[PDB]
Each structure stands twice: as C-alpha cells, then as structure tokens.
Write an enzyme that holds these catalytic residues in place. Sequence first.
Site: not given
Ligand SMILES: Cc1cc2nc3c(=O)[nH]c(=O)nc-3n(C[C@H](O)[C@H](O)[C@H](O)COP(=O)(O)OP(=O)(O)OC[C@H]3O[C@@H](n4cnc5c(N)ncnc54)[C@H](O)[C@@H]3O)c2cc1C
Ligand SMILES: COC(=O)c1ccccc1S(=O)(=O)NC(=O)N(C)c1nc(C)nc(OC)n1
Lengths: 582, 582, 582
Positions: C59, C121-122, C171, C485
């Site tokens: 997921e 459940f779940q 559900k 990093m």
């Molecule tokens: C390992 C690591 C290192 C990093 N090093 C750097 C670095 O050195 N330099 C750097 O820049 N970043 C770096 N970052 C990224 C950083 O964390 C930020 O994500 C980045 O700086 C955000 O830039 P931004 O504000 O421009 O964009 P965003 O975070 O996308 O923000 C955009 C902004 O624009 C506004 N906006 C959106 N759409 C529109 C529109 N149509 N018209 C007007 N306004 C709008 C928003 O609402 C918001 O306030 C790093 C990240 C990591 C993971």
């Molecule tokens: C995922 O679980 C639930 O959403 C659920 C949770 C509590 C009571 C009754 C239900 S349910 O009756 O409506 N459904 C259900 O138990 N399902 C949909 C389900 N699916 C699978 C693939 N395995 C099992 O159980 C072993 N249950």
Amino acid sequence: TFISRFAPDQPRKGADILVEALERQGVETVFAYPGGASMEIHQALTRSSSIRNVLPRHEQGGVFAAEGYARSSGKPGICIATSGPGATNLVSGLADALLDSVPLVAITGQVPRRMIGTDAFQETPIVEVTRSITKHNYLVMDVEDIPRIIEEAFFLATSGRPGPVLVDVPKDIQQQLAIPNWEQAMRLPGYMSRMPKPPEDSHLEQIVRLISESKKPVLYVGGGCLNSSDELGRFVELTGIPVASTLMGLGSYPCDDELSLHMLGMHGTVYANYAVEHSDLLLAFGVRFDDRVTGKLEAFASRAKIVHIDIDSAEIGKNKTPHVSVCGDVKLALQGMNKVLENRAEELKLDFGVWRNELNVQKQKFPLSFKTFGEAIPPQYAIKVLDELTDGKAIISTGVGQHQMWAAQFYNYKKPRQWLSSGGLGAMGFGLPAAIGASVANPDAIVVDIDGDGSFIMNVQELATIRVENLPVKVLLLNNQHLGMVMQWEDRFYKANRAHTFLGDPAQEDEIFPNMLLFAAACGIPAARVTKKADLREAIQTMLDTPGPYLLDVICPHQEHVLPMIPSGGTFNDVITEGDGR
Amino acid sequence: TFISRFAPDQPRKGADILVEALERQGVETVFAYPGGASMEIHQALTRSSSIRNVLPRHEQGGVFAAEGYARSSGKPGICIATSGPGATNLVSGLADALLDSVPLVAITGQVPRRMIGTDAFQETPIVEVTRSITKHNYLVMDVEDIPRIIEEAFFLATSGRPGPVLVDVPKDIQQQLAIPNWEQAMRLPGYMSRMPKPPEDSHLEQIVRLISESKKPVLYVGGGCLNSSDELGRFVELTGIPVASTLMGLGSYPCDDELSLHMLGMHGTVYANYAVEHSDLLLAFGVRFDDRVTGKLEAFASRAKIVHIDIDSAEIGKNKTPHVSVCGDVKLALQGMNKVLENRAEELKLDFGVWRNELNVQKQKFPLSFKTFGEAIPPQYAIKVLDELTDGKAIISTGVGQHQMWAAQFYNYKKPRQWLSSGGLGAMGFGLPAAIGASVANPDAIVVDIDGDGSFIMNVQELATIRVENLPVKVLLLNNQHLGMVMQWEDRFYKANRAHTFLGDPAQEDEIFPNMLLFAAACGIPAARVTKKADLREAIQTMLDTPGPYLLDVICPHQEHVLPMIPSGGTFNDVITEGDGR
Amino acid sequence: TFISRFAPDQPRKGADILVEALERQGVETVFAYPGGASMEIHQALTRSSSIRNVLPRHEQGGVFAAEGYARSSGKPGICIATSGPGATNLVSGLADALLDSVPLVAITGQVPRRMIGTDAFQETPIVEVTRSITKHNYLVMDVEDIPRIIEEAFFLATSGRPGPVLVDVPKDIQQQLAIPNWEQAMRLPGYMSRMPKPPEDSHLEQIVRLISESKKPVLYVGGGCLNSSDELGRFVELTGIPVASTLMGLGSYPCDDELSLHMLGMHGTVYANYAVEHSDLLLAFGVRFDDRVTGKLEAFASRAKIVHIDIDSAEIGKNKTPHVSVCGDVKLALQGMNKVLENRAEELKLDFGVWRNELNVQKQKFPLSFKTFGEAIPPQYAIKVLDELTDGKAIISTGVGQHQMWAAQFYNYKKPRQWLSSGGLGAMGFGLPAAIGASVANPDAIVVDIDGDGSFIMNVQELATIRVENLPVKVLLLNNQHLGMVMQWEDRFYKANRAHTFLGDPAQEDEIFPNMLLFAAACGIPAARVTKKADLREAIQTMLDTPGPYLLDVICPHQEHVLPMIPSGGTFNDVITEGDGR
Ligand SMILES: Cc1cc2nc3c(=O)[nH]c(=O)nc-3n(C[C@H](O)[C@H](O)[C@H](O)COP(=O)(O)OP(=O)(O)OC[C@H]3O[C@@H](n4cnc5c(N)ncnc54)[C@H](O)[C@@H]3O)c2cc1C
Ligand SMILES: COC(=O)c1ccccc1S(=O)(=O)NC(=O)N(C)c1nc(C)nc(OC)n1
Ligand SMILES: Cc1cc2nc3c(=O)[nH]c(=O)nc-3n(C[C@H](O)[C@H](O)[C@H](O)COP(=O)(O)OP(=O)(O)OC[C@H]3O[C@@H](n4cnc5c(N)ncnc54)[C@H](O)[C@@H]3O)c2cc1C
Ligand SMILES: Cc1cc2nc3c(=O)[nH]c(=O)nc-3n(C[C@H](O)[C@H](O)[C@H](O)COP(=O)(O)OP(=O)(O)OC[C@H]3O[C@@H](n4cnc5c(N)ncnc54)[C@H](O)[C@@H]3O)c2cc1C
Ligand SMILES: COC(=O)c1ccccc1S(=O)(=O)NC(=O)N(C)c1nc(C)nc(OC)n1
Ligand SMILES: COC(=O)c1ccccc1S(=O)(=O)NC(=O)N(C)c1nc(C)nc(OC)n1
Ligand SMILES: [Mg+2]
Ligand SMILES: [Mg+2]
Ligand SMILES: [Mg+2]
C-alpha cells in the site's frame, strides 16, 4: 528583593506556593469565589497581606470584574474559581477576553488527580472545554510545576497579543507540601522564538514614503494602540492625517480633536466611513479588519494602498491583503516613523489640508445627530450631559446593545482605558461587574456604568459586591423596557414584529418593570429615577456628588434607533441615515 | 395526524422547519432568550400556536428552567440561545444535565456558515467547547438536515441514559428556503445497535435466587428508578428488603415508609449506611456508585454480593465489581423479577424480619436529629413544617449546600420528580430557575424552592421571569448570611478560619444583607420575613395560601451543621454524628 | 455528455456509485490493493471499462505511485486501500503529499458503520489518525453522500494549494443500493468564500515599480510555479532577472539557461545563495521560505525588499515578513505583470547586466564541482552522462539523500513535472514507486529512477509491479553501500563515527551487498553492473536502449560528499565548499 513569608528551606502547601507565585508576579487584587475544590487556595489567600480579594456573587461576575480590572489598568486580571460549576461559570469571560485580547489569568480548583476522569463530585474537563476559548491553558500534575506554570501563564497572558490563560489545580496538589524553586526556566521555546522583533528602518521608511506620496491618507486605529497613545498622537501632528477609530480603539486618540473622524464601522459616523471609502492610503494600526468594520471586504478601502501593522502575524492578510505589512509592536513602529518624520521634515512638506476639508464638509453635512421629543429623555443627550458633568474624565463601563453604541458615540474619551466595553463577543451583563474591576483598579477615579435594563439585570447580584466592597460605582441605567439592539433589527428587517424583546410586565404595559430602584435598595445603594428631560442634569449631577455607589434609572422612549447604520455585509452606499421605530 | 402549517410543496425558512420539527416532536414549551444570530428562530417561534416561550432574564436561567421542566415531568427540556455569549452562558446547564443524566435539547444560533472560523462577530466554537459536556452535539451545515438532526437529537437525548444534546444552527441556514422531508431515517447505526435488550429470565432468575439465599439484603436505589416507582414498590412488598436511596433517587420509594432506610452517603442516615456496611446482598438499581456514596470503595458494601442493574454498560464495573450484573432497563428488570417472585412465592418464603429489626434498632438509636436554640429558627424544623403544611405533595426545587441537604433530609417525598436538585455537578443558583420550569410543567402543583442566600442571589434576576410569567412559585429562603456548606468545612477542617464565606455586609455585621425582600418587591412579588420560631408555621402557611409568587425569608443561626457526616473518602467507622460551628 | 452504465432509475451498490463518481471526475488510473473491507469497490472497479488499476505489492507503493502520477502529470493521484492495516500503510504517503502540496485522493474501506468503535476486526480510526496529515478527510455515513463527498474531495485536493484528501467508506455503505444524484451542491461555504481572487493591477503595478527601482533583483522560484512555466519564462525575458530555484521548483525555469542561478538552499550553488545574500529585491514566487533554504531567517535576504506571491494566505509572513505581498495564483500574477512590463517597456529601460556579471563571476569562481579518483565512478558524472544520453528530456524519480541532491545538481530539467522527488518530508523508498506512477501517466516518456541502495530496497517489492505492468522504468541505482546523507553528517559532525549507517554485510566488507541484480532477476527485469568509469557511458546507453524495465547497478566510492553545504540554521558565510569523508 521579594521578601517571602516562608523559610527558604521550609515546606508549604501547593496552595501557599501558588499564592506566593501570584505575589511574586505583582498581583495585588484577585476576584475569587470559594468552593470545596479551591478551599486551600482561599485559606492560603487569607495568609497573604499584599493580595486583596473582592468576593463576587457569581463567578461570571468574577471574570468580568477581572476584565474591567485589566482593561482599566493594563495589568492582567486574576479570577479564581472552584471545580465543576465554579469553572464552567467562567466560560463567557474567557471567550470574551480571548476575543478582545484582554490579559487575563484564571485559576480553577480541580478534583484530586486520581479522581480525574471518573465523573467525580463537582468535576468537569475544564481544560478540554476551554482549550478553544483561551490563549492557552494548563492542568497542574505536580506541585513542583506550580512556580513555572504560573510564570508561563502571566508571561503568555500579557505578551504578544494579550489574552486569557487558565490554570487547573487539583485539590491534592494544593495540599501537597514542597520547597518551591523560583528559578525554573519557562518552557516556551516555540512561542518565544516567534515573538516579533523591533521594526526595521527599512519597512518604516517605505511607510513614511507612501504617506508623502498620498493625497487622501486615513488612519484606521484600533484596540492595538491602547498603549501607544503618545506615539500615536505625535505621529498625527507630524503628518496631519485624519484618525478613524474602532470601538476597541476609542480613546487611543482624543475624540474631541478636529483631526478625529471618530468611530467607523456599522455604526460609525458617515464622515469616518467616507474618509475610508475614498482614501488612497489606509494606515491600519492595531486593528483586525472585523466585519462590523469592513462589511463587504471587496468594497472596503478599495481605493487605496493598505499598510497593516499588527503584533499577530496570523492577522496580517486574514481578511484584507496589505500592500505593506509590518509584524510587530505598533508602539515601536510609531516611535520609529516619528523619527523619520522629524528629520525628513522640510524635504517632505506633508500637507493634507485639501483632504481634511473634503472630509470636514462631510463631518458638517452629516454629523452624529439625535432627536428630542417633548420632555422625553433622549439617551444620547443623557450621555452627553454625563460627558459634560464629568469633563470626559470618567471611566465608562458598558452593557451590549443600543446604549453601548450611544455610550460610544456621545462621550469623548481623552485617553485609552477609559472605555471598557465587550466588543468581539459582545457579552451582556458585562457593565456592572466590569465597573467593579475598574473601580478597584482606579480608587480615585469616577467610574460610571452606562447600562441597559436587559444587560443590567443579568448580573444585578453584583450590586451586593459594590456595596460590601464600598466602591464608588455610579450606574447610569438607560431603561427602555426592551432589548434595544434586537428590537431595532425587528423594526428594520421584520416589520417591527416583536419576538420576545419586551422586558416589562405585559399585565401593566405602562409600569416600569422591574423597579431597578428596589434592587439598589436591597443592597443599600442610594438610587433615583428621572423621566423628564428638564430635571436630568440635576439627577446626573446628584449621582456624581453623592459619595459612594449610586443608581440613576433614566427612562427613555424605546422607539429610538442607533444611526447611522450600514447593514451587515454592506457598503458605504448602503448606509442608513434616518428613521426610528416611531 | 400532525396538521402542518405550510403546504406540502411550499418552501419555508430553515427557522420555520426547525420549529415545525419541534412541534412534531411534541414540544409545547421552550425557554429562549433572543439574540441577533437566532432572531429568525424566534420569529418562526411566534408563528407557532402550540409552542409557548418562557423568556428568562439570563441564558443560564434558561437551561436551569429547562432542567426543572425535564426533571419535574420526564419530558425533555428545550432551551434556545443565540451565538457567542448566548451559547457560552449555557455551559453550566449542559454540564449539569450530562452529570445528572437529564433529557435536554439545546439549540443555539450560529454565525453564517462562511463566517465560521474567522473570529466573526459574536461567534464561538460552541460544538468544540461543549463536546465533552454534552451527550452529543451537531453543527447543521445544510437546511436539508434539520428534520433529521432534530429527530436524532430528541432520540438521543431521551433514550438509553438521558442526557443533553446541542444543535448549532447557522444564521444563513435559518433563512434558507426549503421543502422539508419528514421521512429521512436517522443515522445512528452504532448507537442503536448498542441499545440494551430486555432482561433475560436467566439473569433475573439468578437475582431472585441470590435474594432467597441472603440474610441481610439491602436495596441501593438511585436516580435510575425515577420511572419504575410502581415496579420498585411491588418488588419491595414481594421481598420485604430495606430501601436506601441516593440524593438522585429520592422519591422513587416513599420516605415515610417503615422499610425506608432513607438516604445513604456522606450525609446519609446512620442506619442507611449501617444497613449497607453490614449487608450480604447489595441490590444496586439505577445508581452509579458515586464517591459521595461509597467513600472508600474497598470498604463499601465489602461484606456482600453486589447485583448491579444499569442502562449504561460503561457504568457496570466502573468503581465496584458486581458479582452479578444486568445491563438494561431497571423497570423491565423489576417487572420480570416481580413475576418470578409472585410464582415461586410459597417455595421461597422470603422473610428478612430479623435483618429489619437489627436495622430498626439503629434507626432508633440514631435517627436524624436537630437541635433548637431559644427562639431561633432551626432550618430542619422549617422544612419539616413545610412538609406538614403541604402534606408532602409539593415539588421541591433546591440550591446547593447545607439547605440542600436539609431539604433532602427533612422532607418526605411520596413520588419521583418531586425532588429537583443538582447532584453530580452541584451547581449553585439552580433552585429559582428550576422552580420556574417545574411550575410551567405542573401548573396545578405546589412548587416550593428551598434556597440559600448564596445560591438564591446568583440567578435572582429570574424573579422578573416568575412575575411576568405569573407562576405560583414559592421561595422558602433559608437565609444564614453565609456559604453554609463551605463554612461547615472551614469549621471541621480549618479551625473555623473564615475565608470569604460571609455574604453579609461587614460594616453592619448584625444587619441581614442583602434584604431579599426588596428584590422580591422590585419584581412585584409579595414577600415576608420570619425570625422567631414561634411565628414560623403561620409564615409558611401564609406563603402557601397567598395566590401566586411568594418569598419567605427565613432567618437561621449559621453555626448549624449537617449531620451525620462521613468525611470525603472515609468509612462508616468515620461517621461524625455530632457537633456544630457553635 | 457522460454516458453512464446504469439506468437513471436503476439502484446500484454504493461501491458502483463511488466508481462512477471517479469516472465522472475524469479518473482513468488508480492504484489499489484489495482487502476484505474494500472488496466491493474492487468488484465495482472491474465493471469499469475506463479506469485501469495498477496493483502494487504494498500500500505504501500504492500512494507513492499515486504521487508520481500526480507529480508527473498535474492530475490528482488516486490510491485505494482496505480497512485497518491497508489504511495505516498509507500514512507516510499522505503526510508526504500534504508537505509537498501534491493533489491526491485516497479511498479506504472501513468496517460496517455499526461496528465502528468496537475494536472490530481490521479497523482503525483512520480519520482520527490522518486528520493532521491530510488537507481534509471524510467518513461516509450514508450512501447518499457518496457523489457529494467524492466531488468535494477532488475539488479540495486540486484547488488552492493542492493536497491529499482521504475518504473513509464503510463496508455496509458499499453494499447498500441507491439511486445516485449527480447534482447535489458541494458544502464548502467557508473554503470557497476564501478562495483567492485574481491579482489587482494595483499590487502588480507596485511590483513592476519595485523592479525598476532595484539594482540587484533576484527571482526565488519554488514549487508553486510548476504551472506557470511559460508565464515565468516570459517574465524573465522582459526583466532579465536571475532565477534561483528551490528543490521543488526545479524545471519551472530551465537549468541550462544563462540567467539560471540554479538551486539555492543548504546544498544550493554558491552563486545562487550569493545572489540572494546580496540582493535588494527578492521576488519569492511560489515558495514557502523553508529552513533548508533560509537557514538563519534574520540573515536570509537581509539586504532587500521581499515580494511574496502565494496562493496560501497562511504562508505569507509565516517566516519572513514581506514588504509587498500578493495572495493569489502566481500564474495570473505573472500574466498581469508581463502586460505591464510589455507596455511600459521603453519608459522602464530595465537593465540588470551589471548585477548579472557581479553574479556570473561567482558562477565562474564557484561552479558546481566534483572530483574523479582513478577509475572509480563519480555519481555526479554518472548523472551527467544520463543527462547527456537522454538529452535532458527524461522524467527523473528519486530517493532521499546524497543521490537525491546529486540528481538535482547534475541534471538539467527543461520543464516542470520532470523532477519527482520527496522534498518536505523527505521519504525514503519514494523513487521506485513514484517512477511507476510517472510511467503510467507518461507511457511514451523516458522514466529513470535515480536511487540509492538504502532507499531502493525499502520498496523493492514494487519491481514485481513494474514487470507485471510492463512499464519501461529504468533504475539508475547509485550504490554506495551506505546511508549516504546520514553518513556525510557523521563525518562532519561526529568525527566519522559510523552509527548503523553501513548497509553491506560486515562479514564480507568488500562484497557488494545485497546483490541488487538478483532482485531484478527475481522479477524478470534485465539488469547489469558497472564499476569502471570507462565503461559507464555504454552501460547507461544500454539501459536506455533495452526495451522495457532495466536496472543499472552503478558502484560509487562512499566517501563522496554533497557540496557546497550550509549547515542547518547557518548563513552564507558558513557555506562549506570542500572536503569529503576520504
Ligand atoms: C536531503 C534533503 C535536502 C534538501 N536540501 C534542499 C536545498 O538545499 N534547497 C531547497 O530548496 N530545498 C531543499 N530541500 C527540500 C526542502 O525540504 C523543501 O521541500 C523545499 O525548500 C520547499 O520548496 P518550496 O517552498 O519552493 O516548494 P513547496 O514546498 O512545494 O511550497 C510551494 C509553496 O507555493 C505555494 N503555491 C502553490 N501553488 C501556487 C500557485 N498556483 N500560485 C501561487 N503560490 C502557489 C504553496 O501553497 C506553498 O506555500 C531538501 C530536502 C531533503 C529531503
Ligand atoms: C475486513 O473486515 C470487516 O469489514 C468487518 C469487521 C468487523 C465485523 C464484520 C466485518 S464484515 O463482515 O463486513 N466483513 C468481513 O469480515 N470481510 C469483508 C472479510 N474479508 C476477508 C477477505 N476475510 C475475512 O475474514 C477472515 N473477512
Ligand atoms: C452591538 C455591537 C456593535 C458593534 N459595532 C461596531 C462598529 O460599528 N464599529 C467598530 O469598530 N466596532 C464595532 N463593534 C466591535 C466589533 O465587534 C469589534 O470588537 C472591533 O471592530 C474590533 O476592533 P479592533 O480590531 O480594532 O480591536 P481588537 O479586536 O482589540 O483587535 C486588535 C488587533 O490589534 C493587534 N495588536 C494588539 N496589540 C498590539 C500592539 N502592541 N502592536 C501592534 N498590533 C497590536 C491584535 O493582535 C489584533 O489583531 C461592535 C460590537 C457590538 C457588540
Ligand atoms: C453538597 C452535596 C452533597 C451530596 N451528598 C450526597 C450524599 O450524602 N448521598 C448521595 O447519595 N448523594 C449525594 N450527593 C449527590 C451526588 O453527587 C450524586 O449526584 C448521587 O450520589 C448520584 O446518585 P445516583 O448514582 O443514584 O444517580 P445518577 O447520578 O442519576 O445516576 C443514575 C445511574 O442510573 C443509570 N440508569 C438511568 N436510567 C436507567 C434505567 N431506566 N434502568 C437502569 N439503569 C438506569 C444511569 O445511566 C446511571 O449510571 C451530593 C451532592 C452535593 C451537591
Ligand atoms: C469539591 O470536590 C472534590 O475536590 C472531590 C471530588 C471527588 C472525590 C474527592 C474530592 S475531595 O475530597 O478532595 N474534596 C471534597 O469532597 N471537598 C473539598 C468538599 N467541599 C465542600 C465545601 N463540600 C463537599 O461535599 C459535600 N466536599
Ligand atoms: C450575530 O451575528 C451574526 O450572526 C454575524 C457574524 C459575522 C458576520 C455576519 C453576521 S449576520 O449578518 O448574519 N447577522 C448579524 O450581524 N445580526 C443578526 C445582528 N443582530 C443584531 C440584533 N445586532 C447586530 O449587530 C450590531 N447584528
Ligand atoms: Mg434595554
Ligand atoms: Mg447561605
Ligand atoms: Mg546509499
């Protein structure tokens, strides 16, 4: 410096530690109502020789008293209540203080820690309840944290944008013995690292430049200037720019000044709104562009550059997009701009005389006006006489409604913290208790509460407080047998179809009910009534001269209407200038 | 069946839809105080010919009136308020109704939807605030949902464990036109699928068996039996088991019955607690094992098998572990057990005479007792005279404190919903307003409010309501110039060090302050005072005979103490049986 | 227009209604992983002939695929999961999409409504959990609301500031039959009434004026310009102002342009930061003044007027106070400013040649630079060869760490949505899955995932997806046996004390572990390895030419360091320009 009351190595109850924390904070007045969960604190309270307690007759009277105290002084207000019902009865005050940005600190007793969350006797999740209506709140879980929490509470309540802070103290924590450490550092890393820095000459330079480049500048002063009275004044004589104020900013700049456009907003003068409608430079200092002021946002100050200086970043751009913003203390902004203005004096040659005249004409063609009918007492006139007889040096407390608007329109405040009125939340029953606080905070001042019969009665029990505490509170009651403001709206939008807005007795529609004079009598407070306009001046004069408490029941015709009036969400072109329920 | 007021195809305002939803729910009385955000509802309210509105002088008076209505009838109570301050002023009532499990429905106007969350004029996150102090709440976001939400609100408020439900209605939703669909199905899948099922003969069989196998059985009846008066009664004559009751269960079983051990708890009779301390079978029906009843849990009913029947599963095992539980309607449990008891009659031969005597001796050696001093009026005696003169058929409203405990000890309730008193939260200022509701819900009944000078004054403004609404409310004020209950605690645990517990005027320590009679006068309500015990009976008799409203200010010595008394968290061996502040 | 699949009067399962709602939204690709609680939706999914499902192996691979889709196209991304574990496995993606402002819509099955809140459940309170990490979320409580909620979800996800929206579908709601109403109006009064309005010529006029009055102007372009590529370009040729970009804005403006100062920030070029450090006019368009860009706020752009145009009001003034702000669509702001610039052309005579040279010198004295050692492969060079061989027209997906920074430094993006990399949250294991989404959204495009051995392995299971879905994804794995990093930080701040940063097998420290080639083999994806720089170009060339999936394991010396580097919270004077772990 601070001489304690317990040996530096002597254990004391948490209750005793909390009170000493209050003494150490400079607190000398608190409004507390005793309850089982807070007994210890009250006991600890009697051992203090510096803090005096004004016992109200209702916890709501306690908070409102605390607001009045705060509003009339600048100091934070302190109210204390017990668990459960004591606490819940504070809600309206907290919400009110938050909305108007009033420095407040509320302490509520709570059930023992182990009992929390069991539906224990007299318990309620007060921290949960109040989280959204307070600036911040706490739930003390150890006597060791008392000193720190109390310091953080006062710090937060009075810094940045002032506001209410509630501290929940469990009964067992109150009785627990400990050696307080008055050195612990506050844990406010985020808040403190975000506290605005003094204004840069850069920005201030741009503002002073925008001014010189404008022809129709207008100052839109609000509650945020209550501490920059002088700075603001000076700024005005250095630029000669007209001053329109909000209901919360009244007093920041004298109403009796030729540059004063007075109040703007839904019930603002026609000329103040005009000035803003046609301005080219809006200097919004210490305001929060409220709807009772902007109406239709797109139409508000739509012809000018907006400069907005606010201590709260979350306010800049919340409703109107500035063309120039400055996040910081408006007092410092003014201080800086005044310097720049004094130096570049000659090279600036600031003259807005033409603008002021274009305005002074409106101020002439559309001044605040009221009508007199026979010998009936016009509420406006009453207030005007009060202004005259007190020389506008009185502290005015107020209820909510028509009387509140007239008390704002027909009185001339010379300084800030002279006008105490619930604006954001607009809580009724605020006047009498607020007056109590203002009086205790200003013993040698004239304190008049201009109330309405509806508001006055909600917390009428505080008359007992006023007497027992022997406070010289004067109550100028404008009795009109109705819930005025709501009534005015029925007249203009519901074909005058009265829906529960009459406060008198339908059985004797002509008798004044209730007889407010007898309420006063019950609490031994001299009172009098006036019905003829003729003998009004003497009535008000008597009230003032008679030492101590005094209630003057002023009767007015109810068909009166507050004017002018821009209906909710309207434009300057929608302003209503005449008509009454008559 | 229900004849509407609008064409089945005719659009109407949401306000009109909401009122019709109330009419369709059977509502015929509401307590609402008008405000800008709720005008429409009030207007829609005037168009209704079936629903009458009792306008209070304070929103807190509105809710408490709604509680009194509910408590004295069994129907849900309906209060309505405006946005901001109107709403916040309901908090204490909501928390009170939740704690005591009172069916309630509160409607608050709110700012237009688009304005929500902008610090708009008169707005407060009432749903956020009230979430933890209400059974459930809503924020209407579309006029289409009104019918469904109102139905769900009443359903939830009155089903299972009764409780308060708040519905927040935006102003724009109120003015929006629509065609209501009165068929929409409620969206309560979880709640409904969890609603207790009728008791199984299996469990009930085990209880009837436990009974026959016991020698010292004791019934511990609570608020949950207020609707099983007959069922409970029958059950008692089929088993002859002594009945101890909680403060909330008073009336379920007649106090003037020889099998009645009366109230147990912190201030319960010595014999009721004795019976429970030495029982071998505790039949806890409709109780929530509160601390003012158990004290030290490990010591409570520590010698017997505990059978606990409750409609709320979250209550079974919350404090005391039952040996037998039954989640369901106690009324049905009784109905079933009575059947089993009637059939297996002879084969059971239930006889607890020996137990009842072992008890009747304690009831003799330790009966409720008060002392008379000179000609001073004993509050207990006063209440006793009231009992006599009204033949115990009066509906009694109450404040909180000593008077509340004496009003519970010295009056004999014949039926449930005759005793209206705030127990869980213990809110002061509950009596006068509650009386108002009980009276409107029971027009031809005697409604006496036994108040204390402290409580009475908090919501004294409701005297205006009582007069204008011409309600025959009698106020038996037990004036003792102090905050009694808190005072008693100062005496026993703080060497009588008074800490803000005196309500009179220190300047004239001997004068009764305030003069409650004048408050009554202001609202045109005849009143009188009594100081000599001698002329007390006539005073009370007068109050009763005088048509309409009446206030009797009864003066009592303050050094009185409620007895017996088991200090907080104690045991039966800690019960205090004598002493006063004298 | 939209030809349905069910009769306008024919009832269908909620599941069928939800899918049709997706078809009606234009969705043609979703990434869903089947689970018990979401079976119905999957069944309904097979009945659709327009929507295709790419089944991931995890997921988390589903969401990241959805992000890649969104990022590489501009369309919103749609991922679907089951209740409990299915839902929880989306958290990182949601948080990632929120932080980077990526349009996303996630649908999770939930247990039947009645089962909610019973530890069924779940089940997991996914709405509670995800509330703070999503733009908004819903919990469908009635099949009738499906159409409306789905429309509101897409609306909210793609409007204003794009972001993730989760819809929780019980559900039982899925199996419930109904007649969908595709006309219901969205309930977004507040949100919609707060949607920015087009820029006013007023403000835009002030900006164009500030430009002409500056000598050292600098454009600070960010992620917010990804849709104003042309507008931005034009604006640049009309003003000739140097363009520095954020990691999120890469591509908005071509890197291979002489006006391009490239990326600024912690790892930005020395000249880009220089330009900003010494500017007098900072044009911040579509940026959020992140700390990896400002370092010490007080020192950032401290010598110039700041103009900040953002679509999110809560961003203007959050960290840096603008001297001029404009809340609205930067695309429109550019469009307007370009007009003003074209007309007042001659009268403006905009020339910043002197500024550009003062800069072009820094660009010369301090260009991005890497070192080659013997025949070892320099990661920078590898990326450079990839740039060359693909003519910079490839869509590049990335992991997080050193490789991510080099993939940003040594590749020249011609257009936006060519660079897909997790910036705000910086989630590892983002590259392979993101590549999957980009490929499905761009079938005829070259899609190369530049990964690190650490990131690559976290979601290596998605290799199964790439094969089964027969997607031409190329994986340029820069294997350095470490968590780069983090390793670089150990070297510079912890005396190279390795703390769990080695990903190989300590038992055979010289053997490359794991053997990424065999992972590829398991999923039938042709792969190869290169160790000698000499035969690198052919290796990369092969990868590109070989039809379909391909994994090129490139070995690099681990002692490499990303440069330059301004330590966290620093200043331009703290920039590190040399040194490696060697
Ligand atoms: C390992 C690591 C290192 C990093 N090093 C750097 C670095 O050195 N330099 C750097 O820049 N970043 C770096 N970052 C990224 C950083 O964390 C930020 O994500 C980045 O700086 C955000 O830039 P931004 O504000 O421009 O964009 P965003 O975070 O996308 O923000 C955009 C902004 O624009 C506004 N906006 C959106 N759409 C529109 C529109 N149509 N018209 C007007 N306004 C709008 C928003 O609402 C918001 O306030 C790093 C990240 C990591 C993971
Ligand atoms: C995922 O679980 C639930 O959403 C659920 C949770 C509590 C009571 C009754 C239900 S349910 O009756 O409506 N459904 C259900 O138990 N399902 C949909 C389900 N699916 C699978 C693939 N395995 C099992 O159980 C072993 N249950
Ligand atoms: C019946 C009724 C009618 C009303 N009619 C009107 C009317 O017609 N006109 C009208 O004006 N109001 C009216 N109001 C009041 C109205 O509801 C608002 O309370 C008022 O408009 C708020 O004004 P304000 O923003 O200036 O003050 P506040 O609400 O007090 O806001 C002050 C602002 O200043 C900022 N600030 C605070 N301290 C500082 C500092 N040291 N430096 C810089 N910034 C600071 C704050 O953080 C905040 O943003 C009415 C209310 C009622 C009950
Ligand atoms: C000053 C003061 C002193 C006090 N002193 C005492 C004292 O000495 N003794 C005392 O008893 N109280 C005393 N109290 C009151 C006390 O706080 C608690 O309110 C009271 O003990 C609660 O009793 P209860 O549990 O029986 O009723 P409730 O609190 O009303 O609880 C009723 C219970 O019954 C269940 N139930 C409801 N309806 C049904 C149904 N149809 N079928 C089955 N189960 C149902 C509920 O869900 C719940 O669990 C005092 C309060 C104050 C203010
Ligand atoms: C206010 O109540 C509580 O805070 C409390 C709540 C639940 C368990 C134990 C306590 S407590 O033991 O610590 N205190 C207590 O019961 N007090 C302090 C109290 N005070 C007065 C004035 N009356 C009564 O009770 C009738 N209790
Ligand atoms: C109570 O306030 C609101 O609910 C409200 C709050 C913010 C914006 C617009 C409105 S509103 O336009 O829809 N209504 C309004 O302003 N009312 C209903 C109102 N009523 C009375 C009796 N006095 C005043 O204002 C001084 N306003
Ligand atoms: Mg009035
Ligand atoms: Mg008393
Ligand atoms: Mg690596």
